[PDB]
Ligand binder design. Structure first.
Ligand code: NAG
Ligand code: NAG
Ligand code: NAG
Ligand code: NAG
Lengths: 189, 190
């Protein structure tokens, strides 16, 4: 069969997850001798798969893209995700990515939020409240001091949302990441 | 030794082996003194005496480019392959210098698409089939490509603004104007 019709019956057939990232899972399955490598953004039906212990109930579906400038990582990182990459030894295996089949290998890269998100200053609430709006179905934001471990703090929102800043965020170091954007949260005493 | 990029840049004197060559960077490892340094660079200079240097490009293109995330858009936006640094699935990372910047991740090769800010506009002068691309970046690329066409090493780099006159062979409905983060279908016309 085709992997994108075979990698979905994980519950049915013997499966084994190989890697759990911040935003998708890499698992394979065995259907009558054949082995099917594949990656998905949905944890539905991967509990009878071997190595499911650290699997989250849900995977954040925000828009994410790999980070290419290694300096930007400490500031823009919001976790890791799995991606299809070309094999260096010219031996790509067949792997299905989010129900899309292709030949390649699987690699885990650090990622950053991406997409169109507009960040304005609110008027209804206190001076430390902002209004983030995005045209895409689901957009992620994250308040992060550069170098913090807050990979699961990525909040998702459809349409618009509002964020009142807390005092611990109000030092000049914290930055608001929303898709392609990064705004400094001003220091105010 | 503590500063890794120095042995990386001194490959011409050391024993270097090219481990891979993409469309825009080269992956090579050097051994200064019984210690192997893994390395990725965009300058083919100093690697000619490395092993597996036969297909080394004369020079590499500097146009901004990023990995293709939606594998369905690969056939359309592909501009070649480029090496990037990633993490190890077995959690066995090893130090690697990327464009003179040192880190502990592993090396991956990924089909890549043009990126950057590029503005496509009508020329309003001369031939009707003439368009103008505008980019504020120092370096920006553009490439007329048939969804599928193998035009990897034929991407034109333009600083500031540039103008391109559509050839008649390119004026069928099977061609896109690729420039930075933008793609625009050229018209099937006669
Ligand atoms: C289980 O796999 C079958 C192929 O046998 C495919 O139709 C589908 O992905 C799964 N079942 C259903 C009812 O969708
Ligand atoms: C993998 O490559 C083979 C040829 O080597 C090709 O026939 C096959 O279609 C490719 N896999 C997919 C999912 O297209
Ligand atoms: C590169 O190698 C030379 C020896 O040829 C050595 O002096 C040093 O490691 C490098 N060159 C410098 C630092 O000028
Ligand atoms: C990561 O690499 C740097 C230099 O490449 C090194 O200083 C550091 O110790 C490495 N990390 C670990 C956990 O060893």
């Amino acid at each position: 069969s085709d992997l994108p019709n075979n990698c979905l019956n994980a519950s049915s057939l013997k499966c084994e997850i190989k890697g759990i990232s911040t935003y998708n899972v890499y698992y394979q399955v065995e259907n009558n001798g054949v082995i099917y490598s594949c990656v998905s953004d949905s944890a539905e039906g991967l509990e009878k798969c071997d190595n499911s212990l650290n699997l989250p109930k849900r995977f954040s579906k925000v828009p994410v893209i790999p980070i290419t400038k290694l300096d930007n990582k400490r500031h823009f990182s919001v976790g890791t995700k799995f991606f299809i990459s070309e094999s260096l030894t010219q031996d790509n295996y067949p792997i299905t990515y989010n129900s899309y089949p292709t030949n390649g290998t699987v690699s885990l890269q650090t990622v950053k939020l991406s997409g169109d998100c507009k960040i304005t200053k609110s008027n209804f609430a206190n001076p430390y409240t902002v209004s983030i709006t995005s045209p895409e179905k689901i957009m992620g934001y994250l308040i992060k001091k550069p170098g913090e471990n807050v990979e699961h703090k990525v909040i998702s929102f459809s349409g618009s949302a509002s964020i009142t800043f807390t005092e611990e965020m109000l030092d000049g170091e914290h930055n608001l990441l929303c898709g392609d954007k990064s705004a400094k949260i001003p220091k105010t005493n």
